[PDB]
Design a protein around this ligand. Sequence first.
Ligand SMILES: Nc1ncnc2c1ncn2[C@@H]1O[C@H](COP(=O)(O)OP(=O)(O)OP(=O)(O)O)[C@@H](O)[C@H]1O
Ligand SMILES: [Ca+2]
Ligand SMILES: [Ca+2]
Ligand SMILES: [Cl-]
Ligand SMILES: [K+]
Ligand SMILES: [Mg+2]
Lengths: 351, 122
Amino acid sequence: DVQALVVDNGSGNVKAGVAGDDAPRSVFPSIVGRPKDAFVGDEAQTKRGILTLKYPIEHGIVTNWDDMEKIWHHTFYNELRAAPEEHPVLLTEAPLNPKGNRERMTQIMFESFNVPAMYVAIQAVLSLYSSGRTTGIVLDSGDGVSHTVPIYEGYALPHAIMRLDLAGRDLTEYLMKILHERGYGFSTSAEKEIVRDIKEKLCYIALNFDEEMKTSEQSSDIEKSYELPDGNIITVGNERFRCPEALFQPSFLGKEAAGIHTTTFNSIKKCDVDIRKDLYGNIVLSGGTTMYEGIGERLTRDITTLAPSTMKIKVVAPPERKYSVWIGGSILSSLSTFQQMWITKEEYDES
Amino acid sequence: EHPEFLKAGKEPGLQIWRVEKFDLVPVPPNLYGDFFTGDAYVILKTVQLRQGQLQYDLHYWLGNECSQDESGAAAIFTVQLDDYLNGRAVQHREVQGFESSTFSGYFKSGLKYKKGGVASGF
Ligand SMILES: Nc1ncnc2c1ncn2[C@@H]1O[C@H](COP(=O)(O)OP(=O)(O)OP(=O)(O)O)[C@@H](O)[C@H]1O
Ligand SMILES: [Ca+2]
Ligand SMILES: [Ca+2]
Ligand SMILES: [Cl-]
Ligand SMILES: [K+]
Ligand SMILES: [Mg+2]
C-alpha cells in the first residue's frame, strides 16, 4: 500500500511528484547555492547575492554528486514532504548516461536516502510511452542537452542515439547576444532569467528562414513588446525567429554541429532499413525547447527534404510535451506491473 | 506474476484487454469487436503454425477520446507482454478509424465503436 515518487532530473529544472498525477506538482531550478549550508531551487536564486550558484547536472549528466544530493534532499523534504525511505522512487536519466553514473545514483538512493525500491528510466523512452507509442524516434530538447533517440518495440537503440550540439540555455544566451544589436545589455544571471522568459514568450520558428527574414524587413508587424520587471517595455523583432533558428543552423552559435533536422535524419539512418519507415512516421517531440510555435511544420519540411521521398514523415508535437518525460514516469510507476520492475534495497545491499 | 500475463498466448485465439485504472482487465467476450472511443485496449492474436508453434501479434488500440494514462499504459503493457512472450510478438499501433486490415479481420462483424468508456486513472 504505497505510492511511488517520480523525479525527472533536468539540467534546468527538476520535475517531481507522485505516481498517478497528470503533471509534476513540483518544478524548480536545478541550482544549488552555497555561501560565498546549501540552498536549492527558487530560494537559491532569491539569495544569489550571498551565494555561489552551481548547476549539478550538465547536459543531462550529473557532474556534482554532493550538490545533486542536496537537490534530491530538497525534492523529498522541502517540495514533496515525503520520506524517501518509505516510497519507491522512479528516477530519470539521460540517453547514453554511463552505467557508472547510474550506479552512483543508485548507491546514493539506497545508502544515503535508504529508498526501499527504485527504478531508473531513460527520459526519451518515457516520453515515447506518454505519446501512446512503442516505436518512434524522440527528439528531446531541454535546457542543457538535446538527443534524438530511436526506439523500437519499447526499447531504445543505443547505437543510433545522437546528440544535437545545442539546447535551450544556448538559445537563451544567443538571444542575450543578438539583443545587443538593439542596444540591450542583458548579462547577469538575473538578466538571463528575464531573457529566458522573453524567449519563451516571443520566439517562434520560421517555416522558411530566408523568406521570413525578407517578409519581416518589409514592415514592423514582426515587432512585439515585452514588459520587463522594472516596467520598461522591450521590443523584439526578427530576433523572435532568428534565436530558435540556431536549432537548425548551429553555425549561428559558432558551432559546427549538425542541426536538429540533420541529426534526426542521421539517427534514423543508423537504424536498419527495415524499421526506418516506422521511425519517420513517429517523430515525437519532447522537452521545453521543442515548444516553439512553428517547430512541427518546419521540422516536417526539413526532414522530408532530407529523407527518401518514399518515406512518410509525421512529426508529433504533443501539447503537454514539456512534461512528457515526467508524465511517462507517472504512468509507468502507476501500472499494476511496476512492482516487478524495480530493484529493492535488500537486493541491492546483498548484491 | 500478473494474472493476465500468465493467461496470455497459451492457445490459438483472440484475447482482448481494456486498460482500466492502470491495469489490464479482460474484455467480456460478448463485447469483442465493439470498442469504446473513450478507452485504450491491448489485443493478442495467437495463431498455431504448421510446425505446431505459436505466432503472436500484439495490437494496442487507441480510441479517439481515450486519456493519456490509458494510451500510455496500453503501449507499456504491450511492451511488457511482448517481453513475457520472449520478444516474439510483433507489435502494432491501431488508431480508431485507421486500423490495419489484419486487425479488422479478427472480427467477423468488423470493427465498431461506442461512446463513452472507463474513467481515466489521472
Ligand atoms: N514555451 C517555450 N518555448 C521555448 N522554449 C521553452 C518554452 N518553455 C520552456 N522552454 C525552454 O526549455 C528549457 C527547459 O526544458 P526542459 O524542462 O525540457 O529541460 P530539462 O529537462 O531541465 O533539461 P535537459 O533535459 O536538457 O537536462 C529551457 O531552456 C526553457 O527556457
Ligand atoms: Ca477511458
Ligand atoms: Ca517483439
Ligand atoms: Cl526527399
Ligand atoms: K533533453
Ligand atoms: Mg529533460
